[PDB]
Amino acid sequence: AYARTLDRAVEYLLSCQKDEGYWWGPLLSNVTMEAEYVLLCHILDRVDRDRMEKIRRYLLHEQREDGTWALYPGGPPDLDTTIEAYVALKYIGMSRDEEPMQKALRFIQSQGGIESSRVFTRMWLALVGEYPWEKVPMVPPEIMFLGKRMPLNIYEFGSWARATVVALSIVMSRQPVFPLPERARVPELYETDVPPRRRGAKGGGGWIFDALDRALHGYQKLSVHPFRRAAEIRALDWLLERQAGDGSWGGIQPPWFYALIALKILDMTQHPAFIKGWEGLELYGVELDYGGWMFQASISPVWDTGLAVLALRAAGLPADHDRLVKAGEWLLDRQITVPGDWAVKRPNLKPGGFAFQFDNVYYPDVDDTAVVVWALNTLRLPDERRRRDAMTKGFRWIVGMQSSNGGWGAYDVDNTSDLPNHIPFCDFGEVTDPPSEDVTAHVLECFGSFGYDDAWKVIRRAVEYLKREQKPDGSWFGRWGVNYLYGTGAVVSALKAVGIDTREPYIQKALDWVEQHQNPDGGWGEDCRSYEDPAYAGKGASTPSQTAWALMALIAGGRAESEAARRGVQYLVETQRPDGGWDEPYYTGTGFPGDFYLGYTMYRHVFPTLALGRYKQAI
Amino acid sequence: AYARTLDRAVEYLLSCQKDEGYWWGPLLSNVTMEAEYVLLCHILDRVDRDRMEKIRRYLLHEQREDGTWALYPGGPPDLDTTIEAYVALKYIGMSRDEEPMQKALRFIQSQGGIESSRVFTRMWLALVGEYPWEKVPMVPPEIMFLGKRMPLNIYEFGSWARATVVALSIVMSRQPVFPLPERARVPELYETDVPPRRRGAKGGGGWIFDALDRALHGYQKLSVHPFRRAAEIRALDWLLERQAGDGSWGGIQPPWFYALIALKILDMTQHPAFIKGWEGLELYGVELDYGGWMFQASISPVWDTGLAVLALRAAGLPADHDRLVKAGEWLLDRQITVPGDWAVKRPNLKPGGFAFQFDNVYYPDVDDTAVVVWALNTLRLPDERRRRDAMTKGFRWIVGMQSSNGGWGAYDVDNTSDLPNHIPFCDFGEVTDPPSEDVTAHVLECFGSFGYDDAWKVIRRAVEYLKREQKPDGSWFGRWGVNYLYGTGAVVSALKAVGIDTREPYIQKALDWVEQHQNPDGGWGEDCRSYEDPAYAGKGASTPSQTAWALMALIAGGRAESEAARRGVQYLVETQRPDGGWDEPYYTGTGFPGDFYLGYTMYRHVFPTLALGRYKQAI
Ligand SMILES: C=CCN(C)Cc1ccc(-c2ccc(C(=O)c3ccc(Br)cc3)cc2)cc1
Ligand SMILES: C=CCN(C)Cc1ccc(-c2ccc(C(=O)c3ccc(Br)cc3)cc2)cc1
Ligand SMILES: CCCCCCCCOCCOCCOCCOCCO
Ligand SMILES: CCCCCCCCOCCOCCOCCOCCO
Incomplete structure (x- = not known):
């Protein structure tokens, strides 16, 4: 039998x-991988028309009737995912008019717009200049000074979050902005009357952190930040030491991408770590029989x-x-x-x-x-x-x-x-x-x-x-x-x-x-x-x-x-x-x-x- | 006309x-490049028989009638050069009997033997276990703590010496020994009655340094060296940041080689920096029409x-x-x-x-x-x-x-x-x-x-x-x-x-x-x-x-x-x-x-x- x-x-x-x-x-995940990859390419100024195409067929292919994208198949529309996919498409070439763009755009607005997205989503948009850095949770390079047995030292976070934090601290330290051409600007992500339903810290936010954050953004505006240079270098070195063999970082999409961005910030695009890190990406890509191209989260x-x-x-x-x-x-x-x-x-x-x-x-x-x-x-x-x-x-x-x-x-x-x-x-x-x-x-x-x-x-x-x-x-x-x-x-x-x-x-x-x-x-x-x-x-x-x-x-x-x-x-x-x-x-x-x-x-x-x-x- | x-x-x-x-x-130099390369391969346990052959033809080819090697064509026999070439050959396969080995050996002995060679030569031999580390000038990792404006901070040395020092400090910190097979052991480099004519510090040696050195070798024997771990890491990171694009270090033979050894010491043979550094070597190699193979100093x-x-x-x-x-x-x-x-x-x-x-x-x-x-x-x-x-x-x-x-x-x-x-x-x-x-x-x-x-x-x-x-x-x-x-x-x-x-x-x-x-x-x-x-x-x-x-x-x-x-x-x-x-x-x-x-x-x-x-x- x-x-x-x-x-x-x-x-x-x-x-x-x-x-x-x-x-x-x-390994299957969601369009945020490919969407963010598109942005990454723009950042590193390495856009391959042919690849963008493959990435477009994919994005559309994954979009549902309602014109949205979910985290899993047969799942509810996800704002974050849909927002990033929307921005991605518009950059590749889609016009805000075309059906797909229309349906997605409407879903986004009916949710309070960009102000309702996760930190990351707003951060990525911040990196291209479509969102103020000031409204993005701050993570200082200085965090690299906390000892092994101190509150909030990088070793209190999970391996998958640790690397990301270290990489980002450098990025947020400089708060860079890589402008998008006019045709890709997405102001329409704000046009909404719906009240912004912001998501909060996983385990709840304490007024302390809330304040501490406000503090950081302030200290961020000073003309002098003592020992920050050292803080940055501490983070960089931390990364340089743990870069994976395939050129990645932890073998996961997040830190890898941010690490590459951080290196670009420090004019290290001609350094081995970056090069190897860049070409390593291809190994995680996947040619789709229908013309699309997807990037594996891991x-x-x-x-x-x-x-x-x-x-x-x-x-x-x-x-x-x-x-x-x-x-x-x-x-x-x-x-x-x-x-x-x-x-x-x-x-x-x-x-x-x-x-x-x-x-x-x-x-x-x-x-x-x-x-x-x-x-x-x-x-x-x-x-x-x-x-x-x-x-x-x-x-x-x-x-x-x-x-x-x-x-x-x-x-x-x-x-x-x-x-x-x-x-x-x-x-x-x-x-x-x-x-x-x-x-x-x-x-x-x-x-x-x-x-x-x-x-x-x-x-x-x-x-x-x-x-x-x-x-x-x-x-x-x-x-x-x-x-x-x-x-x-x-x-x-x-x-x-x-x-x-x-x-x-x-x-x-x-x-x-x-x-x-x-x-x-x-x-x-x-x-x-x-x-x-x-x-x-x-x-x-x-x-x-x-x-x-x-x-x-x-x-x-x-x-x-x-x-x-x-x-x-x-x-x-x-x-x-x-x-x-x-x-x-x-x-x-x-x-x-x-x-x-x-x-x-x-x-x-x-x-x-x-x-x-x-x-x-x-x- | x-x-x-x-x-x-x-x-x-x-x-x-x-x-x-x-x-x-x-670019032409002397056989110490190829000779040291042979040792490096042994150290990294990456010996290619075919390559050793090409390196042998070269070494012999470069040897003169008297059976020695000089720094320049038509120049006086050089002890250091000849010693390293001798050890290299014996490792590759030459027997201490063969004519070439005989003549070179006699010249070396008539000079006081190994005790008359430069620091480097004795160091390389120290790395393979043919010379006591104790008799080798000490360079501590701690040197990484000297400030920009302090006596003997790495930035007082020339660029070509700086990198070497940083790399070596890690090596001398661990004083590793990669034993040579019996057939390659070279005790005969000591067999000599001639008084050892040791070379001194370029600008003369001050009893201070002489003492300081003796001090360092002593501190080296303690069971605990506070902050040394940090010192090492400081050196490693220094190297990881400045690695050349072609995988080298400064684009010169010395630091490159030592840097690779240092990484081997720190079990980092699977780290990108090391991989890139290893394969980068080929670019500096040169196939000689007569069968030999030489490595460029730069x-x-x-x-x-x-x-x-x-x-x-x-x-x-x-x-x-x-x-x-x-x-x-x-x-x-x-x-x-x-x-x-x-x-x-x-x-x-x-x-x-x-x-x-x-x-x-x-x-x-x-x-x-x-x-x-x-x-x-x-x-x-x-x-x-x-x-x-x-x-x-x-x-x-x-x-x-x-x-x-x-x-x-x-x-x-x-x-x-x-x-x-x-x-x-x-x-x-x-x-x-x-x-x-x-x-x-x-x-x-x-x-x-x-x-x-x-x-x-x-x-x-x-x-x-x-x-x-x-x-x-x-x-x-x-x-x-x-x-x-x-x-x-x-x-x-x-x-x-x-x-x-x-x-x-x-x-x-x-x-x-x-x-x-x-x-x-x-x-x-x-x-x-x-x-x-x-x-x-x-x-x-x-x-x-x-x-x-x-x-x-x-x-x-x-x-x-x-x-x-x-x-x-x-x-x-x-x-x-x-x-x-x-x-x-x-x-x-x-x-x-x-x-x-x-x-x-x-x-x-x-x-x-x-x-x-x-x-x-x-x-
Ligand atoms: C069944 C066996 C599981 N086993 C423990 C192996 C394993 C471990 C970790 C992963 C994993 C990979 C990537 C991501 C993210 O994209 C992510 C997104 C956001 C952040 Br912040 C960080 C990482 C997440 C998880 C997948 C599988
Ligand atoms: C004519 C223009 C010159 N111009 C300044 C360029 C230039 C600079 C440096 C080199 C040079 C390269 C390698 C070495 C060593 O082998 C060496 C050996 C021992 C130690 Br210690 C360190 C390096 C030495 C020098 C060659 C050329
Ligand atoms: C992390 C600080 C970024 C600011 C860059 C200024 C760096 C000044 O270098 C000081 C001298 O050290 C030599 C530099 O080559 C090393 C590369 O370090 C990489 C990015 O800082
Ligand atoms: C460079 C000094 C070598 C001593 C390192 C051993 C430290 C013990 O591990 C503590 C955790 O840190 C992670 C280290 O492994 C990552 C690579 O860093 C390079 C050399 O270990």
Whole structure:
């Protein structure tokens, strides 16, 4: 029955594997990437007509009937996104008259205009001179002077925010303006009677920061700022030291772009770091078959490869399958062996983690590290020496990364400061990197493969963490994946692997929750709205991935031979394509709950296989 | 008569011009470049067997009958050079028995062995573990803390020494040892009864430094060095900021190599700066037709192009010659527009100088800047806007670079501290960059082209400088060229161009000196020994370049229609080759008086043409 499905799924995945032996599916986000890229090019004065064209087809293509753009497919119109896309188009050549421009423009106005956009959006517009810098939250270079153990020092922010802050401080220090030609000026973004509904700091704004900000903008106007030169250079050097190998910065769109702008400000366009940083961009671009061109918010080669293996293995392929060995060898050459920013909290910890992308040594994440090691642990590579050795390093690194609450974060340890969440500047996404349930889950699942059970203190401290975090309905929040189905699946799957008794009450209370949301079509689905409106928890169109997750939670809980269980399997078997793959017009990945969503291209193929592979195991 | 000579010389130069429109002749030095490269590769663990082979052919090729190597062709055996070449070969594969190894080894021993070599040589050997680090002059990272106006701060050293110091401080901070395989160990470098004749600090060693050094080596042994981490990082960042565009550092062999080693020490082999720095090396390498491979101490594209133009122009070609325009346009794209280390002394000075090599913005030198501007001033480019503009920037820069004595240095202003010359570490070449006669001369000649005469204060202050520096015999020392013929020519030529009366006494006393050294063969020549033994002043085998220089001094002094004058011309006319070029088996370029000599490949073709072009002008 399901066998034929698996056979097709397997041969498919194997056909997607690159020559080097790794898998790499594109990452989907929203048009702000491409939109901001257009502006960046204008800033750096490097506009390629032909590319602008490809970027135009894309933008329009992504626009919806109402003439707006959303964060995820089938999502509500987003002001910020739409504003940036609007400005982008108008710059490329669109006239404010054309239908697309008209519809989008009207949506923007009906929202209070530009004054309702996030800090970033207003900042970008500020950079081109379409918005006063004075009305933009201030971040001083001086911030570079705060010590390791001081309120608001760059190491209190999450890795993804840290770099951005350092880069921007230099930019805001100079508050540069790169004028747009008249044809692109967008004053119409102000023409609106609707009251501006401004967004506030994530965790709420304290009058202190509010004042402090007003203070900064004032000090900004003085004719002399003592030690600012030093402050700037401190930031520059900080960047110069951590530039990724591919020329990026952290392997993410934000800092990379701002870092390049900062260098342009400091007349360093002929310096190696900038050059390498510039041409590095192409690697993240993507030619679209319909003529468009998109820029990836980040790349997931390692991540994809890791899950790809675990899936193919759990599916059936030999632990020494010559094709899976290509992956094993590849993964071993990826392991990081040098101190990263995480070393600031664990100086006596030995490097051994892995990164999300290709070459990003200063920022290994616990998630990848766990999945990679675990994946390797299920293989038989020619050189048992390095396999044995590597796993050990990674293992020990993961352990030494465990936070105080027994949980695991993504990049840093106990990065749980609550101070940064109140700054005026931080009004978008997460700013700190505290421990999460899904990351912790994957870790336990990893150790589990080795055998380490509940007896070991480390495991228990974590389990306790998860138990305390479980939601009233017995569900688990999904941090880097949409959402409760994603989390619950991970946890249960983990707990099952660490020896815990699946018969437990809270465990059962979880499985029930799963079966309780199984859509009529047999599969499961959860819309990204489940981050905003609690009514969508476990609700949404069924997707290959989300179905596989809920399917794993069941197989782990012993209910593999159940109705809902066998039903969900049917879904996957049926909805499968002739080539063996699966389609997924929806996003199941999460960047920042309620603010940034991602589309993991491989998920629709990997998880369904992994789930089916495990179902075939329960029989 | 000479006409046919010129026509052939011109068409020849034009045939050497690259497509982009610039000239670029290889730069010759000594085997220490290649020898150290071999060690570097070993250090970075990147040895290419095939390359080692090419490097071996070269090394042997350069070895003389006695089995030694010298700094210049036809020069006395050099210990340092020979030692490094010996170690290099033995590493590549040579056995201490083979004839070449035998002769060289004996010479080394007859000199007191390794204990008689320069600091660098012992340091390199220290890096591979063939010499105790303790016996190597110490240079602490802490040096990075000295302020702009403090004794021995990095800005008291010459640009070429500065970078090296910063890079090395990190290396000496860790005192790493990269062991050589047994087959390469060179203990035999100690086996000698001869008393070790150690070289001392350039300007003599003060017991203070001697003590201070002993102190540093002691502090080096402590279990804790407060703020050293910071000191190191201060040095690293300093390097990361000034890395050249081609991946080098200053565009010279020394710092570049040490900088790469320093990065290797700091586990930064996967960092962009290191990668770019590594592959950048290839650009300086050179394939030799006989199988060998040499590495250039530096590259002279700009320098060559500049003189090439002035020669072709003074020769006859139209100021708008389509071929000379390729050069003009090219040169304009070279001008630097950002602050360099020179800005530390002239913060309110606007960038406008040029560099010696292709892409080296942080280190423009007065010499190139002068020759380039002047060269442009003799052309008619399509865009008189930028030609006019560029010249002005460069001109004003040169002016603002003039030192206190009215003379011009090479890279910095008043870089005349005498303190660094006494440090134990500085026992090789120049360490400071004070004003010189030849540089000042070229500058005056430059302004002269514009018309600025002795009336202008700047010119007078300089002329006074030259007058005070003139030697008893009315000759002028040659700093960056061998030697008195080189200097005298420059000065006289300059003074003539700035309006000065050539009939003056000191001027005449100079010309006489020239005619007085004309060899029998009609031409002039000066051996590099003229830096060590004053008996060689103006003495040596005749060379195309040196003849052209002395020939210019005469043409400028009005004695163009003289016997010696017409005689020297005959030499050039006769000694010319069928293709129109000229041969020059001797070095006429100077790096560091008595310690480092260079061979400028283009000199033998450019100067002879320029001189003949000017002779044809006197008629
Ligand atoms: C399932 C595994 C997840 N795992 C932890 C890996 C991982 C880590 C981080 C990312 C990520 C990448 C880019 C962004 C932003 O665009 C962003 C936008 C705004 C700011 Br401010 C900063 C970054 C965000 C997140 C994606 C995947
Ligand atoms: C005729 C015009 C000259 N003009 C000023 C240009 C110019 C400037 C500097 C060079 C030069 C290059 C490399 C070296 C060393 O090898 C060296 C060796 C030891 C140490 Br310590 C540092 C550098 C030396 C000098 C060559 C040419
Ligand atoms: C340059 C001194 C080398 C000592 C560095 C080790 C510092 C410990 O890590 C602390 C965290 O800072 C992150 C460092 O890794 C980034 C690259 O900086 C270059 C050399 O480490
Ligand atoms: C960060 C300050 C930016 C202002 C630029 C003025 C820099 C003056 O340089 C002082 C001398 O140091 C030599 C410079 O070359 C180094 C490049 O530093 C890069 C940008 O500042």
